[PDB]
Amino acid sequence: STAAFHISSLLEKMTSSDKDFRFMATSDLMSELQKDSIQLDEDSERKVVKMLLRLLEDKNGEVQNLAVKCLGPLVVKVKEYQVETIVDTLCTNMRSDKEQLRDIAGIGLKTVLSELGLATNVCRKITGQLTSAIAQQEDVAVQLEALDILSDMLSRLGVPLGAFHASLLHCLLPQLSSPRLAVRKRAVGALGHLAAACSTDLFVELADHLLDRLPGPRVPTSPTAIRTLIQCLGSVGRQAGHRLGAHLDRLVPLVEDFCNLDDDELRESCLQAFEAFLRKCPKEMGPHVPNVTSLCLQYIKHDPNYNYSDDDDMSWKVRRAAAKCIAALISSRPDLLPDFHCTLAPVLIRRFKEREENVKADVFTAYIVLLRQTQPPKGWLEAMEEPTQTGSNLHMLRGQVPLVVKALQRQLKDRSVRARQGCFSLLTELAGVLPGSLAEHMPVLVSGIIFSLADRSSSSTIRMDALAFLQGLLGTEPAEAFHPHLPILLPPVMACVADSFYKIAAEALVVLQELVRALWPLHRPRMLDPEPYVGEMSAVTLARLRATDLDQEVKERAISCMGHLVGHLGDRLGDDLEPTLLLLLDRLRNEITRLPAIKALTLVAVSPLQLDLQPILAEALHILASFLRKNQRALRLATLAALDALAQSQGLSLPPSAVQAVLAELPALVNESDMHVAQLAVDFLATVTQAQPASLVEVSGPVLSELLRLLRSPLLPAGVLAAAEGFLQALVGTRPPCVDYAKLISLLTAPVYEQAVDGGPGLHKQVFHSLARCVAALSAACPQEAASTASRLVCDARSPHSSTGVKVLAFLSLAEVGQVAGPGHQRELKAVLLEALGSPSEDVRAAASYALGRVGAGSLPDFLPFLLEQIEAEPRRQYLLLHSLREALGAAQPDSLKPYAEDIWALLFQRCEGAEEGTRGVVAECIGKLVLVNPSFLLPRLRKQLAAGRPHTRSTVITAVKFLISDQPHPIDPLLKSFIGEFMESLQDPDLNVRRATLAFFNSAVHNKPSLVRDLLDDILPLLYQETKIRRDLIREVEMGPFKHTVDDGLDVRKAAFECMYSLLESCLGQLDICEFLNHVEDGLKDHYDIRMLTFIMVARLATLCPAPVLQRVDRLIEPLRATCTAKVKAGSVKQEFEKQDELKRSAMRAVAALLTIPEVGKSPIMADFSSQIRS
Amino acid sequence: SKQIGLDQIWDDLRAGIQQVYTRQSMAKSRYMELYTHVYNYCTSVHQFVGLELYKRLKEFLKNYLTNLLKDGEDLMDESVLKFYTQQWEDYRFSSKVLNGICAYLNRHWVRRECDEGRKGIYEIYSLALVTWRDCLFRPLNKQVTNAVLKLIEKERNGETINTRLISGVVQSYVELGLNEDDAFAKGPTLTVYKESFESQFLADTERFYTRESTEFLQQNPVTEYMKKAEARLLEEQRRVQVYLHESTQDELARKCEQVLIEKHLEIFHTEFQNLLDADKNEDLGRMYNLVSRIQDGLGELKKLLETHIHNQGLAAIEKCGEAALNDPKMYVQTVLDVHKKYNALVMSAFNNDAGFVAALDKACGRFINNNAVTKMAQSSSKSPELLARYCDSLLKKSSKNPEEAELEDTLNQVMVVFKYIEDKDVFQKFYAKMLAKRLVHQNSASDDAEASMISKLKQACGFEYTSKLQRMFQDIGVSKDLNEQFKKHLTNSEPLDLDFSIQVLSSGSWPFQQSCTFALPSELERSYQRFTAFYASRHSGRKLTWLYQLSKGELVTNCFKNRYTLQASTFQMAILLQYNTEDAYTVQQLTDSTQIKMDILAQVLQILLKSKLLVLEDENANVDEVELKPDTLIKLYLGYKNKKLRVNINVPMKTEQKQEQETTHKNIEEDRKLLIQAAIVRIMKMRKVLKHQQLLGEVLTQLSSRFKPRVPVIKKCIDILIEKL
Secondary structure, eight states, X not given: OHHHHHHHHHHGGGTTTOHHHHHHHHHHHSSSOTTTOOOSOTHHHHHHHXXXXXXXXXXXXXXXXXXXXXXXXXXXXXXXXXXXXXXXXXXXXXXXXXXXXXXXXXXXXXXXXXXXXXXXXXXHHHHHHHHHHHHTOOOHHHHHHHHHHHHHHHTTOTTTTTTTHHHHHHHHSGGGGOSSHHHHHHHHHHHHHHTTSSTTTHHHHHHHHHHHHSOOSSSOOOHHHHHHHHHHHHHHHHHHGGGOHHHHHHHHHHHHHHHTSSOHHHHHHHHHHHHHHHHHOTTTTGGGHHHHHHHHHHHTSOOTTSOOOOSSOOHHXXXXXXXXXXXXXXXXXXXXXXXXXXXXXXXXXHGGGOSSSHHHHHHHHHHHHHHHHHOOOTTOTTSOOOSSHHHXXXXXXXXXXXXXXXXXXXXXXXXXXXXXXXXXXXXHHHHHHSTTOSGGGHXXXXXXXXXXXXXXXXXXXXXXXXXXXXXXXXXXXXXXXXXXXXXXXXXXXXXXXXXXXXXXXXXHHHHHHHHHHHHSOSSSOOSSOOHHHHHHHHHHHHHHHTOTTSOHHHHXXXXXXHXXXXXXXXXXXXXXXXXXXXXXXXXXXXXXXHHHHHHHHHHHHHSTTOOOOGXXXXXXXXXXXXXXXXXXXXXXXXXXXXXXXXXXXXXTOSOHHHHHHHHTTGGGTOXXXXXXXXXXXXXXXXXXXXXXXXXXXXXXXXXXHHHHHHHHSSOOOHHHHHHHHHXXXXXXXXXXXXXXXXXXXXXXXXXXXXXXXXTSOOXXXXXXXXXXXXXXXXXXXXXXTTHHHHHHHHHHHSSTTSXXXXXXHHHHHHHHHHXXXXXXXXXXXXXXXXXXXXXXXXXXXHHHHHHHHHHHHHTHHHHHHHHHHHHHHOOTTHHHHHHHHHHHHHHSOGGGTHHHHHHHHHHHTTSTTSSOHHHHHHHHHHHHHHHTTOHHHHHHHHHHHHHSSOHHHHHHHHHHHXXXXXXXXXXXXXXXXXXXXXXXXXXXXXXXXXXXXXXXHHHHHHHHOTHHHHTTGGGTHHHHHHHHSOOTTTEEOXXXXXXXXXXXXXXXXXXXXXXXXXXXXXXOGGGOOHHHHHHHHHHHHTSOHHHHHHHHHHHHHHHHHOHHHHHXXXXXHHHHHHHHHHOOOOTTSOHHHHHHHHHHHHHHHHHHHHHHTSXXXXXXXXXXXXXXXXXX | OOOOOHHHHHHHHHHHHHHHHSOOOSOHHHHHHHHHHHHHHTTTTTTSTHHHHHHHHXXXXXXXXXXXXXXXXXXXXXXXXXXXXXXXXXXXXXXXXXXXXXXXXXXXXXXXXXXXXXXXXXTXXXXXXXXXXXXXXXXXXXXXXXXXXXXXXXXXXXXXOOHHHHHHHHHXXXXXXXXXXXXXXXXXXXXXXXXXXXXXXXXXXXXXXXXXXXXHHHTSOHHHHHHHHHHHHHHHHHHHHHHSOHHHHHXXXXXHIIIIIGGGHHHXXXXXXXXXXXXXXXXXXXXXXXXXXXXXXSHHHHHHHHHHXXXXXXXXXXXXXXXXXXXXXXXXXXXXXXXXXXHHHHHHTTTTOHHHHHHHHHHHTTTTTSSHHHHHTTSGGGHHHHHHHHHXXXXXXXXXXXXXXXXXXXXXXXXXXXXXXXXXXXXXXXXXXXXXXXXHHTOBSOHHHHXXXXXXXXXXXXXXXXXXXXXXXXXXXXXXXXXXXXXXXXXXXXXOSSOOOOOOOOTTTSOOOOOOOOOOOTTTHHHHXXXXXXXXXXXXXXXXXOOSTTOEEEEEESSSSSOEEEXXXXXXXXXXXXXXXXXXXEHHHHHHHHOOOHHHHHHHHHHHHHTTSEEOSSTTSXXXXXXXXXXXXXXXXXXXXXXXXXXXXXXXXXXXXXXXXXXXXXXXXXXXXXHHHHXXXXXXXXXXXXXXXXXXXXXXXXXXXXXXXXXHHHHHHHHHHTTOO
């Protein structure tokens, strides 16, 4: 009963008695009630609109803005049957002549449009009203606001007006000829906005209508007639130029002819239109690039009033337009960079002396665009390049630099701030593109910088820009070039440190730090004597650091600069060394300068000057140990780095009590929650163990326990394990009474020892790998502690009483001790290992194979002949033995295998003729890793074997060359890139195995290193598609009763080809033809189920990688998808076919939805009906 | 029906079926014949003694499967999958045909099936698959799962493998998940596939990606890690879409997003800030795309972006320094540059997200008002004022008229700045003043641009911000029409001596006030009286706006050898007209006669002396270093020689400039008083009586569209109104 009498009670309040209270009454009527505050009796709502006619012109319209901010939700709370009525009455009162009701009507109609058969009808009524206002209502005040609302409504209502657009253009066409240009300009703007979504033929009609009225039949005409047409042409250019290529060929000569006419504004319009066309239509403007270019090269110089009345000149606008056109031409078409360097770059340079300001700024911007275009590709600025096309461009720029410097020399001392800022920016860009090129002109540039550092009257912007330019120059140019100018350059910078504006102080401090880090490098002998300056440097920095009422930024910069100064010149500070250090220590305690002080202390400790940090060791160590307890990752990392550096630098000159205090905190850090902190902590423990062992007596226990608990985890990276290895190296090498090895493996095997039943919850295979690898690496770390235990373990483990874990750990530890530090002699281990290789358990067999493989490499001249003899005499167990051989050649350096390598060759292909697939594959990797011994000499033998040999031989050869691919850069890359053609030409072999192996080779090459096959793709793609087509000769429908599934043997090659096709899609998209790509997609989509799924994935990816070809082809692409979805399978089918049909239906649905995400695909009947059927 | 002997027929079809398990070598004939013989007759045979027959079939299949297991455990260790596939397809086809033919004898009897699950015939329709699960699947499941996981990890590293083996084995896994709940339920049960392969695969995936991401981030920058993660996510969705069941898909995605993205969020946050310090937009787009997947993971990004925008704007406005307080151009241009850059970034990299747009608006609405310039101006009402002055400098006549398109763009930028300033009534007041002073002196560069500006203001705020301005425009038009009509009347009567322009301004619109007393020279007396008589004959009921310090014009001097035209204000006109008789006047007499205040007269005196139109007692005395006392004598410079015929001397005064600054202070205080009283006491009356706390809270959102009231001000207004509530 809330919203029943509440509304009606307030209705009587609008009877002119509560005019002051009506404003609050409407605001109260709009409250938090917008859930179900609607009922019958629309008489109330028409009374509301009548009363909101009183929140209008009356009472001077004081409550109008608030009235409409309140009626917005009111006019959306009106319902459709009153929506039509309110739209009609808004139109009728727009017809009213009051110049006040029209504002409320327009803004209310805008609100209604924002909120929204009936909608279409009201939109048509609004459009008709607007058209009548524009055309029929021949008074300026109505046309102008009608155009305003029409433009602001097209800006967001492009699509709903598609039916009325054709008429709208008509009512906007004569408007380009009406007087009172205030309407003409907005008509041009509205027409340009309209010509953005006006179908596909309406734009053509507009273009070829506007073209007709433009020209004069070989006779001059008044510029006023054609000026508006050219302006409209430019507007439609900037808006939707990419639809005017067909008419460009006829528009361009006319625009040029009008540009030849004598009028400044006309020339402006023509040049702006040329800019729009050039930036929007690069391809269609090709045959017109030269002509327009000449025009620019003239009108950039156009200035008749100036020899080589300030309110009646506009030639500078012509020059600015010409410069902007040149910039657009340069940016649009990179292909013509060299030609510009011979025709555009010189002229532009000659215009660096432009008398104006905006013209000069645009010339500078054009040259900066040219410089950024000449930039060589990034990621390669680390070594010299061959004289390619980029080499020619860089040579042109290097020859250009002297002219740029000569032309810019005078401007650096100009009185204007803008010119100096432009010169600084341009020279910074030029230095960035060409490092080390401005050195020869240093006597000039430096002078300019000084002129901008002694400046006082102007703002601080010029000073800060000068300092930034100096910092960039220090970063780029070599240090030596600054030596002659140091006596003059150094004082002013220091004078900027003591400035009263803190930003300048911070910038000067940063520049000073860069200067001291660059002129006096750390690890090289000093070429310049630093005595004359260091005193003043130190005085200024200390004076700035000793004031505690300064800002935070200056404090941080001063701390960093003083840290760098001490670290690089600790010798020359002298009497200021002892106080300065203490200052840093103080800054180490505040909560706002913890991190800069820590970094400065780290840098001071690292420096090779061998400073005397004795006074602050105890305090710094205690403070850092206190910091270790806090739970912040960045602070912890900084503290560990500082502690490690300090310990390494100090060595044997540090107090023991502080060492114990800091060591009492470390065991809490060694945990699996974070790994980087654990690695740093272990490194610090190793360092302090090497330095001062006596402090480790009382901390060995918990540290060892936490280290073992960390090693329990299966997520140890190699760095943590190496750090632990080094820790144990030091802990045993120190020969302390606390811990001296012989406890790691024991503790690690303690749960393994209790595993008396080999049927419980064992580790995962990868968990086995990680844990056993860590344990064996620890065992093999120290060889001196384990010298006798290496032989002891074989004796105590050869007995088959221990569990499988102890056994596998024994073989892995033996392999690791033979690998890490010298091959374990163990002359009697060969027989035991051979006996145990035939273990019943597969894990023990793999461990034995790994052990043999890793022990053979270390003792190849003795065991390799024995292994080959065993292979020759006994071929029964060739699988594990071949894995061992593979591991042996993997772990043996090629330089030690060259004399005997050929012999292994004579063996490996001897076993290549077998019928076992696994042995063939293993021999393939063996050959692949044997080629790594010498690629140049061993490659031709494999090439000739592939050219002439048994298919079982060339298949293994091509598998080996496939395995020869390495993700990292490898020395065979040039040879492989040169020789890949012969290998890739193997698909003509009718044998299935060779073709499949070559397809796998291609897939691996594309996935890992696309550069190997990229240059050859054009000679690969066609023949590759030959494998895509289905071959029916291999398809044999064997007679298995009435019904049988065909056993197609050519499916694997098709699958491999499709995998290669996907890899090319993901990596080599730039060298593919989309038409044949989609044709092969269509051909394969009807193939086997796996091909169907992969093709569906390809279609899903192409729906985002090429919307236009997919949109074109979808009209026929849907039919296979529709047939796939609508196929009906009998309920008598067993679960495989049900699951397969469900999966294919879901995949096809996903593909259909991915296609539907494209808006254009959504505007066709076939998939709309398909979606309707799916919903139904 | 017949009851033929059991053993003979049993051995017959046993031999037939053990031949059929082998690959077909004969033709279709006996395949029809034997199975038709079974179907037509042995329905009763396969029903009751069919229990014994099916037990014998089960033990035969048991020995067959044991033989297969014994022959399929020789070496393997990877070749397990090829054997398992080939055998699975072969046995699947054999069991499918056998179950299609032989089970028809006992099936279709759902009535018997319901009772106790049809005795021992329960779920024996797929007893071939049951035997596959028990006899052979159980011993080899661990080996095949380990081989599959090894192959997947091998493919993850970069190598290429034959996915058909994995696809076949996972299809086999999901196939044996028979739906025992209902034999006619449309939908598979994935119990065995989930319990034997899915959990292990998911755990392996999470472990591998944890290790790989940690190792990568330990020795690489964040950008490369984001690049790698973006590819890895789609790679691991493609794997499932290709050779894995669909039920895993969604779950797998979650796990990846919980390892590659979420667990590193902290690092990402820090990196985000660093990116904002270098303006690497593509990396920001990548980071936004990555973090979009994590639910409620974008909030910290919004907070960081807002804080960064605020700090950047504050620093950029502070860097200008002291020159901002007197140069509107640099202040507004700095604001516009910051806003344009960060709006472009938000629109391009962050895909125009609503939350990021709100963050930009909140950041920009907090450094327009409270920044360094207003802080050193001691009042937050300096941000609007300067803006207004900027608009003035965009519309006064200048040497270089800006481009029309450039002018429209600049006005639109001024609007997008004005959208943020809290105090808008100050802007309206200052704009009205500047517009009036421009209209009176006719300094408008173009009427079209000025009307467009008024239209923009009307759309922005409403009809109140433009009613007064439209009134001013109509008044100036009416004055022009009246001047033309009086010119017509003059042409129809005695003409005037000199051509002067007069404008009649209604007192109820223009902000001008009369604050000085003047004495009319005899030259303008006849025009004055004639115009007063004419206007009295024309209009009545209002008061004439007669002001003289705003009246300027041109004068011609006959006291120089070369005829020069001097354009000057009315005070300078009176000063020069007083010299028509005597060229030497004392300052005290000039003050007594011309009724000009000492400061204004003194300033006019320095302006005249600097122009060299007049001389002091000592012609060589420096004007700046000589004070003008009331007894100072000024003489006419009769021998004035100059290159330019037209001379302007009516220049605004520096002392008048500081007086105008004082008038701006008075304008600000007038705004304060009018605002407070005549805009809060009225609304307090409107709201009537309430609890006095939520009333205070809610009155702030009824006047908020044009200022923000302060709580002590509203309390003072309530205290004042407590006399009448």
